[PDB]
Subunit: 121 residues, 4 copies
């Protein structure tokens, strides 16, 4: 099975624990990033997301928001669960990192984009 | 004030109602998209997200996930609330749309990106 | 007609002059950005791109690279030319801004994404 | 050295040959994609780009446009050359794929985003 519940780790070394997914596809969890651009100490951050429940797909899409507890930014992840050739689950995700800008004129430079690959711990 | 709670509409005509934001910055709501690539009839979809609570910023960043009830995809929004020159609130967001792909080999083509500007209704 | 040749201006106030498009769809030009995150003075920068010519579409897709002459970054634009409801040409583009990072470990944070809308001057 | 000139292959199996980079940082080449969403047979496609020449960086940023000869879309790549721990050259790139849409109302769904990692052949 390819279930979001459990512990995950991505290619950067970030930790991710996801709790039970309810009948509506909602789940919470904690995110421990290995990499930060801030000068603050990294701290465990809550994550909230949902997984698509249409058709009850064996590899449903999902998204979640990480509310960083040491930064003023927000990252959103979206991706899908895959059972690779071997039979091990993989989460392929793309993310957007939103920085805080003091002016709406600086908004053009506030969004970063990137990918992450999560495997089970 | 620039508060996510209330009704919003974006440049595509999509509706968005966000409920109260709790002390942890979590909020739920419903999303009614005006535009769909599916052949299904559009339907109101739940959204879940959080807004950054670090520093009590008057224009905090936020992210939320839309779990489409008529599609098998997931969209994640991230952006910031702005009080423009006049004094009207604006949400500047970028989003990722994740489609469902049956194979991990098709994963490269599953993510769309775009922007939305939300104003109060 | 919706031809890339000529002068353009986007929602940020950036200037853009595109030269003739050759039979292979290649074109050069200059880009004058109104907004910069650097402390350097902005300077006119060359751009190089091509436009798709597969079906001689009235609104072909295109892409080009801006090689900033005052920054160490690179921006790539991709979009399409549209003849809007009125009859005025519009270029709808999305871009990626690549910053220079000293280490491959910092590569995750080096890419920005955003949109631009160009109208004729 | 980390020079764009030569042959490259990415994680999808796509081929890439880049010619000499001139004093202005311009280069051409051909791109052979392993993966296509079209029903057409894949064909070698020209690419045009430039690499940043500011500061004579040993790992300068670059961008290029692929003008697909079998599709009506355009892909733009932007990234940086890295000399990894061992001594291998790696191109870390993000790309935007622009599809052709008949109407400006469909423009919201026309852009895909993704990453590619290129190693020397
Ligand atoms: C992600 O989770 C893994 C699994 O626990 C963490 O790896 C362990 O980290 C501790 C920290 O001292 C080490 O003592 C263990 O030996 C590590 N185990 C393995 C198997 O590597 C990892 O630290 C977590 N990532 C982050 C950023 O906290
Ligand atoms: C977004 O919300 C607005 C505000 O209610 C909707 O606009 C109304 O739509 C109804 C539908 O028949 C019309 O009767 C009203 O005249 C509209 N009011 C205004 C001020 O335009 C709009 O339909 C919503 N968008 C979607 C996609 O449902
Ligand atoms: C983009 O092009 C426009 C058109 O020339 C520029 O607007 C002019 O800028 C000069 C600069 O002093 C003014 O004197 C003119 O009055 C402006 N004309 C209009 C119609 O606004 C604009 O400056 C260019 N953008 C950048 C960033 O250089
Ligand atoms: C990318 O380049 C490599 C290197 O030539 C190609 O790999 C060869 O493909 C031919 C095709 O029949 C095989 O006969 C060789 O055995 C392959 N060599 C290796 C080392 O794998 C590859 O085909 C190219 N990719 C694409 C999409 O054409
Ligand atoms: C603007 C920038 C570059 C980013 C901001 N910093 C942060 O957002 C740190 C919070 C942790 C982000 C972890 C991302 S999230 C996606 C990816 N996947 C993963 O595991 N880690 C990364 C603010 C400052 C100003 C410091 N800097 O400069
Ligand atoms: C693959 C593609 C193109 C997309 C998929 N369709 C959907 O995801 C429809 C669900 C509503 C999305 C609304 C987006 S969300 C961001 C933006 N902002 C806004 O208001 N609307 C848009 C699946 C199919 C196969 C049908 N097609 O083909
Ligand atoms: C990392 C960051 C934020 C960006 C880098 N700066 C630059 O890239 C300036 C070069 C001009 C870019 C213009 C973009 S391009 C797309 C968009 N459309 C438009 O017209 N303008 C904008 C480097 C530094 C470190 C200074 N900062 O910090
Ligand atoms: C809309 C969509 C999904 C895409 C369009 N197809 C193409 O653009 C095929 C041209 C080759 C693209 C190769 C990309 S480029 C970045 C990445 N890196 C790599 O090596 N390959 C991939 C049109 C149609 C309608 C067919 N489909 O549906």
């Amino acid at each position: 099975k390819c279930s979001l519940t459990g512990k995950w780790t991505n290619d950067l070394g970030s930790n991710m624990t996801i709790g039970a997914v309810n009948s509506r596809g909602e789940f919470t969890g904690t995110y421990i990033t290995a990499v930060t651009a801030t000068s603050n100490e990294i701290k465990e951050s809550p994550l909230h997301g949902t997984q698509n429940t249409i058709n009850k797909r064996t590899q449903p899409t999902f998204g979640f928001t990480v509310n960083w507890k040491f930064s003023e930014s927000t990252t959103v992840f979206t991706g899908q669960c895959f059972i690779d050739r071997n039979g091990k689950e993989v989460l392929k995700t793309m993310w957007l990192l939103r920085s805080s800008v003091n002016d709406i004129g600086d908004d053009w430079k506030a969004t970063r984009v990137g990918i992450n690959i999560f495997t089970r711990l």
